[PDB]
Symmetry: C3
Subunit: 282 residues, 3 copies
């Protein structure tokens, strides 16, 4: 790990003295969900590039900012553009923000992302709550906590079986009910793979057999660091496509479809998240 | 990644100006298949060591060369001796050649290798066409594309479900028919594991349950980079041994058997590949 | 790998000339099993920190020593405190000792550890003999042998299907019989995951489906290097807890329970190991 405890500290204090805002909830916007930033009131923007110690967003479009503000009553801090392992970032960089949030006083982390559907029940457009995850990179050593543990953040061997707040998932199925929507709110297990290339049919079948419902290339690391911090964690995935699971189909997963689906489900997610805010304690 | 775009460029241009040859098809010879180099006509040899930016073949025998020439009508470039992850090479070195070939004008990549049989149907000597692969190293981060993407080579999120040219596999089952052989031409999924040590019984059973038919320690990376380049990809494995899947057997996988099997299936593979050449478009 | 052959040599010779002891059996004490060091007679202690080239035990408690002596007749060398991948150590450091032992003249390696129970048959307190292992980190590249092979230690492609000495496991089931205990001596497959965080329910289910019986974050690397050396290998796990495999349970794996269980099974393991010593040939 390239960061010493002071680095997280100095980044937090810098932000703390450059904004009057004091967030309680940190929200990480996945692919094609960055719109959530518009609904914040008294919004103060910070380009990642100007924040001390932040991973310099190489070239995904150079768009990477930390937006502070109020979202339906709660003091939020949003990450528009997140860091992925496939871009070359070691996991201690990918999750650097999460530890900064903790030192800012945040106690809740909402993670969202796009993901391919492994469960045949799911359909494009669907929203899947994350009940659990399978951290494939983690089994091999790519775990954000690898390296000496710092007591100031958490214990050496944190547990993950209760990573996704049982309360928030219930208060979420409620919100969806109140919202009264056609499709029911899905719920399942998210499996993380490093990417960046898409899975093959044989790989899709492996992920299904392992019991995964959706597949992505992020989230799990942030969740692990969050939990190690004591943060409350809630998250969901937007099924932007159904992974090819048979050799006959002449269809291929592509970033166009993923962003396209993110486009149509845009406001649908903004509402859900915005309303869900009120359901977060304090 | 230690290579900048110019490095691939300079390596290509160097070769381009040191040989009159202009290959269309690149062939990577797996273990005990290097013989394919004899059948090239107007053969021009280059030791890896003399090619700018090529991974310096540490000590597997110091035998590593790029042979250009004509193989049954087609302008070929062959790699005699390939780089493996288990030798310590990062994947961006292992696959460095593939990107060089692309800049040389190659549009087709033929990959061959030796592999242990997971499918009980298979028998030593058998040849298995690769319909698909399971990239275990890739799930954890060991993907040759990890790092910033270069638009000049391909897209950020390339798809792999159609990696193995459906046309060539058919034109290959044909060639085998024409060849009229005892054993039928096998076809299946290749799973890559890093090695270098051989799998245990419990590991063999895992790989079988995942739906793999053959197991090796290479290929997948080159295939991924090839596809990311737009190259056409065809490949097969020579089942040199049947992996131990029960605790009673007092047999052990060994490099002697693997090379021995490669020895007997020698000319059988040279024919197949040589004839298959004519089946490649242009 | 940061070590050259001379480094292993110089470390061995240093020890060889600083102790009159000449061990035959090397014993690696897992979590809460370090007590085995008390039963050695003519015990000579060496702090890791004073041994040339040894990984400097960062901050797990600064307790890391190599204890030489006699254990029930045999010349032993014990490692009290072992190196884990999750602490940040590359595998060639984690397994550095094993190669040192080989050069000291050791021909047998006994590895012990604590592990969560995946097999429902098992219960806390149980002792599971290791018949086989599933090296998940190894499938992705985290294999201690990665890098150029040194003929002086072993072959390039060592086999692992016969890693756990069939003879010693039998002579062990015997010893347990003689010992006449309530619970029968368990036996099974150990799956290694990198950690340091504990598995989720979805991950537990994956590990069960793969056929694993117990789960830990160590051992496999040392075993692989041992075997590559020609060493005889025997090992077992102390089931310190049953991994959570259903979402209803409001229980969580924790280092307190693990050490607690290690505490009660303390002397039970010391006896077993001590007596087992006589069953090791010479
Ligand atoms: O089919 C899929 N496989 C793996 N990840 C994704 C995702 C998630 N994100 C989306 C994004 C690519 O379009 C990249 O960062 C991965 C959507 N669909 C799939
Ligand atoms: O049983 C097996 N397991 C994993 N790989 C192979 C291979 C393939 N190559 C062959 C070569 C070792 O003999 C090494 O580079 C791996 C043949 N048989 C097996
Ligand atoms: O449930 C489990 N999952 C993974 N490893 C262990 C272990 C083994 N060791 C024990 C130790 C943590 O308490 C750490 O180094 C892992 C015991 N229980 C479990």
């Amino acid at each position: 790990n390239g960061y010493t405890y002071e680095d997280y500290k100095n980044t937090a204090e810098w932000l703390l003295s450059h904004t009057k805002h004091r967030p309680q909830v940190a929200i990480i916007c996945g692919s094609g969900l960055g719109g959530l930033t518009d609904k914040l009131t008294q919004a103060q923007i910070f380009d990642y590039s100007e924040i001390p110690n932040f991973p310099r967003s190489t070239v995904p479009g150079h768009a990477g900012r930390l937006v502070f503000g109020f979202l339906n009553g709660r003091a939020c801090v949003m990450m528009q553009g997140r860091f992925h392992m496939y871009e070359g970032y070691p996991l201690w960089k990918v999750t650097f923000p999460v530890r900064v949030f903790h030192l800012l006083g945040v106690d809740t982390l909402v993670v969202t992302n796009a993901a391919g559907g492994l469960n045949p029940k799911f359909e494009v457009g669907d929203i899947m709550l994350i009940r659990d995850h399978i951290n494939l990179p983690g089994f091999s050593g790519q775990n954000p906590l690898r390296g000496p543990n710092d007591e100031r953040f958490g214990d050496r061997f944190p547990a993950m079986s209760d990573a996704y707040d049982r309360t928030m998932r219930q208060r979420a199925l409620s919100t969806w009910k109140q919202m009264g929507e056609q499709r029911e709110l899905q719920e399942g297990t998210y499996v993380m793979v490093a990417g960046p290339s898409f899975e093959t049919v044989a790989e899709c079948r492996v992920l299904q057999k392992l019991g995964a419902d959706a597949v992505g290339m992020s989230t799990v690391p942030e969740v692990i660091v969050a939990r190690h911090c004591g943060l409350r964690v809630f998250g969901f995935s937007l099924i932007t496509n159904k992974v090819i699971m048979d050799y006959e189909s002449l269809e291929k997963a592509n970033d166009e479809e993923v962003l396209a689906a993110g486009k149509q489900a845009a406001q649908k997610l903004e509402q859900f998240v915005s309303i869900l805010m009120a359901s977060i304690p304090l």
